[PDB]
């Protein structure tokens, strides 16, 4: 056979391109890392460094003191013992707190009073890291094109996770820490609602989750078939088309119906994802406060 | 109820869309030219974007795109039938014409820029310090064509800086002559390299450098392209 | 009915049968061999996709079905009114993928770049394959595949799937999951980054393959570069697939008790299985 360009049959190294600078704080850049000999079969082999800036930490940080409450909580059914905490990690589970209190900052710690102070440095810890998405879009001097995508996930998220739970009054209608539980919740969520494939947001969310599949699964079917044409770098391609950005369209063209340019191709994906998590994000939104149920809307259609 | 309105209000987000999409993609292409090189019948129920003003790296100049697509060239294809359509047969040599597979570029004659300065497209016996870690080092692998027949060793290895990745082959050919061979398109083994595209007497046409140290966006279609042309013309003797 | 470029390349030869023949344009669709092929086969396909909708009595998409031969029947022929269509045409509309595929690839021998498409397809056609030619006919019956209805398939899935216990407890589902949802991640940064770094702020330079990279090095401490996050997509995907192609030739060949059972392998293991604490204990 031949070369399915996906092994570089060799590898080779200098120092490390450590980057550029603009109006970056370098004074904040760190050491450089090894070189893992492997991951260079694929991207670089080059490893780091990173900007520790004054978001650097709050962000990592805040998101540690989340995972050092479901690492305090599993310490505690595991009943502080290192054979328990392996066996029945999963199924450890930390719920919300009951619709009892409902919208109170006074539950008590053992009985899902310790959800909330985990999931306040869950959200200081996405909000401390999306803010930061900006500042290195910044200091390089790129659109928000990065920064903006990423609010598409908190999008979803924040229905999940603070949003639907508002106009329910119940901490109770959240997910929560723990392996198997959540899996559960989603079931038990397709359920207290009815049935979700009849929801055009799960059928259409859905819908996403298959193009960013069959799409972007193409742009590498793509891209690469003609990299022996500059087809890899993207960029200069855009700035000056070669056989490369030709014969790609091309092979669509003369397939599909028609195909995309160079620039486009990207803005074409870009939306077809961040729309999983926009028309999810919405999907749930609704019920449990527009409608207490989904078999209904699938007949009545008002 | 809200329940109806949003699964409307966004089929227009959604067609509304389908729309800003397929229009920023159609300028570098369209309009057509006929088949001769003239505004064609039906012109999809699609504009054309109000062009936009790029700003390259460097002040090397700007583009504007879309814009005046000049076919900065000739073609050797003449028409075996009648109606729009059907194929265009090869005048004489395809391959250094330029033409089917082979084809290649309208593209500056320049050599890409890191975002540092220097030429980006460098040669390892003038990378800054490049050895090759791990892999099968091919300097000095007497690289072999379809045919059967030796036709050159490798000499040197030409790498992308920042982007740090094996990208071409300096090979020198039956007269101490170099020419380069695109990575993405042979084989390393155990002692011998092997190029599937072209054959031994083929890489005397392979279009050449003009500075074995710096070589152009431009050339690098012309060869790639050409030796990709020899997958279908060049295989009577493989 | 032409791009501005697309003159020179349109050249004869190019073919797997036939030759100068079935190898020709249409205005800007191609042709070949499987050109034909991918319409004899499909059309006869819409040809049943009337004929069963009529015996079935309405015409709305929103319940149109062919149902697959019923849990009976077996593995025999079967006459046309249950299944015996289902089939056939399963059949057809499958002989059209084969050619979609066949003609994707006259279509890089034109061009002959590389064939990293006519494969990327061979993987959702098996995703296809296996749930209806493998799957079925090593379970018992055609009968269990899915139904080529619009609103009848939907409730394929929630059915079957259930039909194990909840369903997410399937290791080589929630693993072939994960293979999903990241590679959207993916295509996430993918285009936010490469389009982030095309129209960067208004008035400054247009960036470069170099910024790129640096974006995440400054933010993750990596970069899988360029070159290379364009098999990451690639693969990422293909493999969720392959990975789910499997979680469901699985389900019922080799393991029928609720998936969820499964999950004991573990719990109930030597050196900690009876041990007191924990919520099995
Ligand atoms: C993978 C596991 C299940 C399955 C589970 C689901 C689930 C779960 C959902 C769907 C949904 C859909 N499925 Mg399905 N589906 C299966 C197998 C198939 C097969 C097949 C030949 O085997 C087909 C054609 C489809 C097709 C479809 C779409 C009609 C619809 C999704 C839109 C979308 O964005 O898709 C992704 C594809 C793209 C982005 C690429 C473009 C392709 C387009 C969308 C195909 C349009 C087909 C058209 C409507 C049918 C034409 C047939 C006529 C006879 C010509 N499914 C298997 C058996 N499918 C969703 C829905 O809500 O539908 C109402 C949904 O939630
Ligand atoms: C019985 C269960 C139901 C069901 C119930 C639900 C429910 C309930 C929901 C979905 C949702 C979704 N379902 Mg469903 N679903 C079913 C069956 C299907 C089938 C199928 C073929 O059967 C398919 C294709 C889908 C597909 C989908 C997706 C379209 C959608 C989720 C998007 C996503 O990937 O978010 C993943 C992306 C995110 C969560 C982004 C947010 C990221 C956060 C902020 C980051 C945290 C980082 C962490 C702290 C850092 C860790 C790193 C450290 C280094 C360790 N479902 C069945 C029938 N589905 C969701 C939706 O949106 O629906 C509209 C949803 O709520
Ligand atoms: C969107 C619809 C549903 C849903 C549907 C599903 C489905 C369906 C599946 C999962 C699966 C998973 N889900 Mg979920 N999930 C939901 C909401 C959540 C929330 C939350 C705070 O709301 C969390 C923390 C999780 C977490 C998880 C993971 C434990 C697991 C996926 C691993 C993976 O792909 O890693 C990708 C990781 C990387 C690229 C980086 C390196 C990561 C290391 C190794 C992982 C640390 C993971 C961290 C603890 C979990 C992060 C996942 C969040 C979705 C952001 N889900 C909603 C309610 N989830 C999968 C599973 O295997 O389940 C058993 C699965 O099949
Ligand atoms: C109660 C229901 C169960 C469940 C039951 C099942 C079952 C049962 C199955 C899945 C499968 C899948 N499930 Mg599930 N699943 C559940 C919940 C979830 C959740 C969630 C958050 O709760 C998620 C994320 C998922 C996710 C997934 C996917 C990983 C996977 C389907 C993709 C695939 O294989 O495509 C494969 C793609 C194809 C078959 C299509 C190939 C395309 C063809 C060739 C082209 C046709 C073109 C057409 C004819 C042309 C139209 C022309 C127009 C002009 C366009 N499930 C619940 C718990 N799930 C499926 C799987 O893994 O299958 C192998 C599967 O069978
Ligand atoms: C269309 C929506 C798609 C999407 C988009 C998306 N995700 C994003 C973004 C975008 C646009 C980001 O900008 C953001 C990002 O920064 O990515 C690199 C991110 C992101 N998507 C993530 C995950 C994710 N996205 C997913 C999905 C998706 N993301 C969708 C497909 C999924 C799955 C599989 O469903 C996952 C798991 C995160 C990795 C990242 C956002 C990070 C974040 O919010 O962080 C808060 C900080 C913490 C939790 C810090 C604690 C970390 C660990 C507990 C510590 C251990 C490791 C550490 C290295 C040790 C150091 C030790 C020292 C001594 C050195
Ligand atoms: C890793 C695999 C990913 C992938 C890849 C992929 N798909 C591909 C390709 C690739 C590489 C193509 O080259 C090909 C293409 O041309 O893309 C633009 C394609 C393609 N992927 C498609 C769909 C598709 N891919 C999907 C998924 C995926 N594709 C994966 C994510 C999905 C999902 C999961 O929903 C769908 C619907 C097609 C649009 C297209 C191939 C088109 C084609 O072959 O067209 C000619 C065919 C006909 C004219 C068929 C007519 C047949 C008869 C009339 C009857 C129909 C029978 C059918 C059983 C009915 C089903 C009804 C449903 C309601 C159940
Ligand atoms: C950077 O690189 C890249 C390119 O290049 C620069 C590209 O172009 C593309 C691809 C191009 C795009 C524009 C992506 C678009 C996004 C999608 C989500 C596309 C999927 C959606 C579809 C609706 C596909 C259309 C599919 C079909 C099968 C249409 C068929 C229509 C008919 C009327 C049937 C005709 C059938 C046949 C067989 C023709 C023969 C006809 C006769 C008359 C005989 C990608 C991915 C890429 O990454
Ligand atoms: C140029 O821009 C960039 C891209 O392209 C535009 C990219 O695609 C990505 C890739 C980003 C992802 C989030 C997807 C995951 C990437 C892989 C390369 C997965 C490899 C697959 C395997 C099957 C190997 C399994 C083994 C391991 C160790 C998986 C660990 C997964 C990670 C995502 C770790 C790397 C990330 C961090 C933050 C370090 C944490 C370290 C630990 C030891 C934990 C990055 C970072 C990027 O910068
Ligand atoms: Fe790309
Ligand atoms: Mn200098």
Redesign the pocket.
């Given at each position: 056979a031949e070369y399915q360009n996906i092994f570089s049959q060799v590898q080779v190294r200098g120092p490390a391109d450590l980057g550029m600078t603009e109006d970056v704080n370098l004074a904040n850049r760190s050491g450089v890392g090894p070189f893992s000999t492997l991951l260079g079969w694929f991207g670089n082999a080059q490893l780091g460094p990173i900007y520790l800036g004054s978001l650097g930490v709050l962000s990592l940080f805040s998101g540690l003191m989340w995972f050092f409450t479901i690492g305090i909580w599993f310490w505690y059914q595991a009943g502080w013992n290192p054979a328990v905490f392996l066996r029945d990690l999963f199924f450890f589970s930390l719920e919300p707190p009951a619709p009892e209190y409902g919208l109170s900052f006074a539950a008590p710690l053992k009985e899902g009073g310790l959800w909330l102070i985990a999931s306040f440095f869950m959200f200081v810890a996405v909000w401390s890291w999306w803010g930061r998405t900006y500042l290195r879009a910044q200091a390089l001097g790129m659109g928000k094109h990065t920064a903006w995508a990423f609010l598409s996930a908190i999008w979803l998220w924040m229905v999940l996770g603070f949003i639907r739970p508002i106009l329910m009054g119940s901490w109770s209608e959240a997910v929560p820490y723990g392996i198997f539980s959540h899996l559960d919740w989603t079931n038990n969520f397709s359920l207290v609602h009815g049935n979700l494939?009849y929801?055009?947001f799960?059928?259409?969310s859905?819908?996403?989750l298959?193009?960013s599949?069959?799409?972007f699964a193409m742009h590498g079917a793509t891209i690469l078939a003609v990299s022996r044409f500059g087809g890899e770098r993207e960029l200069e391609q855009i700035a000056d088309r070669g056989t490369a950005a030709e014969r790609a369209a091309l092979f669509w063209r003369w397939t599909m119906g028609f195909n995309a340019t160079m620039e486009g191709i990207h803005r074409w994906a870009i939306w077809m994802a961040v729309l999983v998590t926009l028309t999810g994000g919405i999907g749930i939104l609704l019920s449990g406060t527009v409608v207490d149920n989904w078999y209904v809307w699938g007949q009545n259609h008002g | 109820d809200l329940a109806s309105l949003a699964i409307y209000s966004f089929w227009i987000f959604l067609a509304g869309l389908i729309y800003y999409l397929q229009t920023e993609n159609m300028r570098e292409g369209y309009p057509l030219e006929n088949e001769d090189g003239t505004p064609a019948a039906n012109q999809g129920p699609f504009p054309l974007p109000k062009p936009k003003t790029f700003i390259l790296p460097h002040g090397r100049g700007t583009l504007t795109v879309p814009g005046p697509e000049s076919e900065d060239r000739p073609i050797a294809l003449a028409r075996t039938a009648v109606s729009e359509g059907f194929p265009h047969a090869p005048t004489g040599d395809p391959m250094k014409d330029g033409v089917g597979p082979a084809s290649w570029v309208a593209r500056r004659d320049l050599p890409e820029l890191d975002g540092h300065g220097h030429n980006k497209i460098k040669p390892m016996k003038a990378a800054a310090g490049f050895h090759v870690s791990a892999g099968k080092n091919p300097i000095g692998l007497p690289v072999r064509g379809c045919d059967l027949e030796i036709a050159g060793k490798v000499v040197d290895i030409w790498v992308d800086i920042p982007e740090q990745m094996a990208r071409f082959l300096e090979v020198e050919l039956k007269d101490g002559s170099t020419r380069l061979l695109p990575m993405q398109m042979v084989k390393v083994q155990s002692n011998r390299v092997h190029v599937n595209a072209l054959s031994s007497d083929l890489f005397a046409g392979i279009p050449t450098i003009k500075s074995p140290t710096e070589v152009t966006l431009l050339e690098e279609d012309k060869i790639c392209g050409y030796v990709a042309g020899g997958l279908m013309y060049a295989a009577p003797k493989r | 009915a032409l791009l501005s470029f697309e003159r020179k390349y349109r050249v004869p030869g190019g073919t797997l049968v036939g030759g100068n023949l079935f190898d020709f344009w249409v205005g800007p669709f191609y042709v070949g061999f499987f050109g034909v092929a991918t319409f004899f086969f499909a059309a006869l396909?819409?040809i049943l996709?009337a004929w069963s909708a009529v015996l079935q009595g309405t015409w709305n998409?929103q319940l149109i079905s062919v149902y697959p031969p019923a849990l009976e029947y077996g593995l025999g022929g079967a006459p046309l009114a249950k299944g015996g269509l289902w089939q056939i045409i399963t059949i057809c509309?499958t002989g059209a993928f084969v050619s979609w595929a066949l003609r994707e690839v006259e279509i890089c021998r034109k061009l002959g770049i590389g064939y990293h498409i006519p494969f990327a397809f061979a993987f959702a056609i098996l995703?296809?394959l296996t749930?209806?030619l493998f799957r079925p006919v090593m379970m018992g019956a055609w009968g269990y595949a899915?139904p080529?209805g619009?609103?009848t398939?939907?409730d394929?899935?929630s059915n079957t799937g259930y039909t194990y216990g909840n369903f997410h407890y399937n290791p080589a589902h929630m693993i072939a999951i994960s293979f999903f949802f990241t590679n959207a991640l993916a295509l996430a940064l993918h285009g936010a980054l490469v389009l982030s770094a095309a129209n960067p702020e208004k008035g400054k330079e247009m960036r470069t393959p170099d910024h790129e990279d640096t974006f995440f090095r400054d933010l993750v401490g990596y970069s899988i570069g360029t070159l290379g996050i364009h098999r990451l997509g690639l693969l990422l995907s293909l493999s969720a697939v392959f990975f789910?192609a499997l979680c469901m030739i699985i389900t019922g060949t080799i393991w029928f008790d609720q998936w969820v059972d499964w999950w004991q392998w573990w719990v109930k293991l030597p050196w900690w299985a009876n041990i007191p604490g924990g919520i099995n204990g």
């Amino acid at each position: 056979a031949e070369y399915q360009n996906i092994f570089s049959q060799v590898q080779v190294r200098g120092p490390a391109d450590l980057g550029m600078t603009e109006d970056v704080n370098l004074a904040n850049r760190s050491g450089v890392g090894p070189f893992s000999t492997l991951l260079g079969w694929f991207g670089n082999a080059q490893l780091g460094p990173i900007y520790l800036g004054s978001l650097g930490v709050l962000s990592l940080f805040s998101g540690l003191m989340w995972f050092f409450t479901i690492g305090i909580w599993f310490w505690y059914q595991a009943g502080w013992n290192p054979a328990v905490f392996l066996r029945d990690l999963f199924f450890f589970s930390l719920e919300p707190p009951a619709p009892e209190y409902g919208l109170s900052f006074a539950a008590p710690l053992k009985e899902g009073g310790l959800w909330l102070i985990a999931s306040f440095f869950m959200f200081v810890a996405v909000w401390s890291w999306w803010g930061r998405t900006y500042l290195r879009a910044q200091a390089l001097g790129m659109g928000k094109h990065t920064a903006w995508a990423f609010l598409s996930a908190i999008w979803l998220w924040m229905v999940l996770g603070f949003i639907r739970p508002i106009l329910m009054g119940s901490w109770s209608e959240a997910v929560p820490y723990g392996i198997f539980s959540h899996l559960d919740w989603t079931n038990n969520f397709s359920l207290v609602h009815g049935n979700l494939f009849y929801n055009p947001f799960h059928g259409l969310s859905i819908a996403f989750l298959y193009g960013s599949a069959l799409l972007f699964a193409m742009h590498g079917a793509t891209i690469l078939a003609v990299s022996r044409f500059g087809g890899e770098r993207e960029l200069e391609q855009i700035a000056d088309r070669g056989t490369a950005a030709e014969r790609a369209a091309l092979f669509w063209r003369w397939t599909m119906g028609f195909n995309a340019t160079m620039e486009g191709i990207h803005r074409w994906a870009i939306w077809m994802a961040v729309l999983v998590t926009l028309t999810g994000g919405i999907g749930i939104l609704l019920s449990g406060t527009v409608v207490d149920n989904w078999y209904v809307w699938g007949q009545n259609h008002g | 109820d809200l329940a109806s309105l949003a699964i409307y209000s966004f089929w227009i987000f959604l067609a509304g869309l389908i729309y800003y999409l397929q229009t920023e993609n159609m300028r570098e292409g369209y309009p057509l030219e006929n088949e001769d090189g003239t505004p064609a019948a039906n012109q999809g129920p699609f504009p054309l974007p109000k062009p936009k003003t790029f700003i390259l790296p460097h002040g090397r100049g700007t583009l504007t795109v879309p814009g005046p697509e000049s076919e900065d060239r000739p073609i050797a294809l003449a028409r075996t039938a009648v109606s729009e359509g059907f194929p265009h047969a090869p005048t004489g040599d395809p391959m250094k014409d330029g033409v089917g597979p082979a084809s290649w570029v309208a593209r500056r004659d320049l050599p890409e820029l890191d975002g540092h300065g220097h030429n980006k497209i460098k040669p390892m016996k003038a990378a800054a310090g490049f050895h090759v870690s791990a892999g099968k080092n091919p300097i000095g692998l007497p690289v072999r064509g379809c045919d059967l027949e030796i036709a050159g060793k490798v000499v040197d290895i030409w790498v992308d800086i920042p982007e740090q990745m094996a990208r071409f082959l300096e090979v020198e050919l039956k007269d101490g002559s170099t020419r380069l061979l695109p990575m993405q398109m042979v084989k390393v083994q155990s002692n011998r390299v092997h190029v599937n595209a072209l054959s031994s007497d083929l890489f005397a046409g392979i279009p050449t450098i003009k500075s074995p140290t710096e070589v152009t966006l431009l050339e690098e279609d012309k060869i790639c392209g050409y030796v990709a042309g020899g997958l279908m013309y060049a295989a009577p003797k493989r | 009915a032409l791009l501005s470029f697309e003159r020179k390349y349109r050249v004869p030869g190019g073919t797997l049968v036939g030759g100068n023949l079935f190898d020709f344009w249409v205005g800007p669709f191609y042709v070949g061999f499987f050109g034909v092929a991918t319409f004899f086969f499909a059309a006869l396909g819409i040809i049943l996709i009337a004929w069963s909708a009529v015996l079935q009595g309405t015409w709305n998409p929103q319940l149109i079905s062919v149902y697959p031969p019923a849990l009976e029947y077996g593995l025999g022929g079967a006459p046309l009114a249950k299944g015996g269509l289902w089939q056939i045409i399963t059949i057809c509309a499958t002989g059209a993928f084969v050619s979609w595929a066949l003609r994707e690839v006259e279509i890089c021998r034109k061009l002959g770049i590389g064939y990293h498409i006519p494969f990327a397809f061979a993987f959702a056609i098996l995703a296809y394959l296996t749930l209806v030619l493998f799957r079925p006919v090593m379970m018992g019956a055609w009968g269990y595949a899915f139904p080529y209805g619009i609103w009848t398939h939907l409730d394929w899935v929630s059915n079957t799937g259930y039909t194990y216990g909840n369903f997410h407890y399937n290791p080589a589902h929630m693993i072939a999951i994960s293979f999903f949802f990241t590679n959207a991640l993916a295509l996430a940064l993918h285009g936010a980054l490469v389009l982030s770094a095309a129209n960067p702020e208004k008035g400054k330079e247009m960036r470069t393959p170099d910024h790129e990279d640096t974006f995440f090095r400054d933010l993750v401490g990596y970069s899988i570069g360029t070159l290379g996050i364009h098999r990451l997509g690639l693969l990422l995907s293909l493999s969720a697939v392959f990975f789910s192609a499997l979680c469901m030739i699985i389900t019922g060949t080799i393991w029928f008790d609720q998936w969820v059972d499964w999950w004991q392998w573990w719990v109930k293991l030597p050196w900690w299985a009876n041990i007191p604490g924990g919520i099995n204990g």
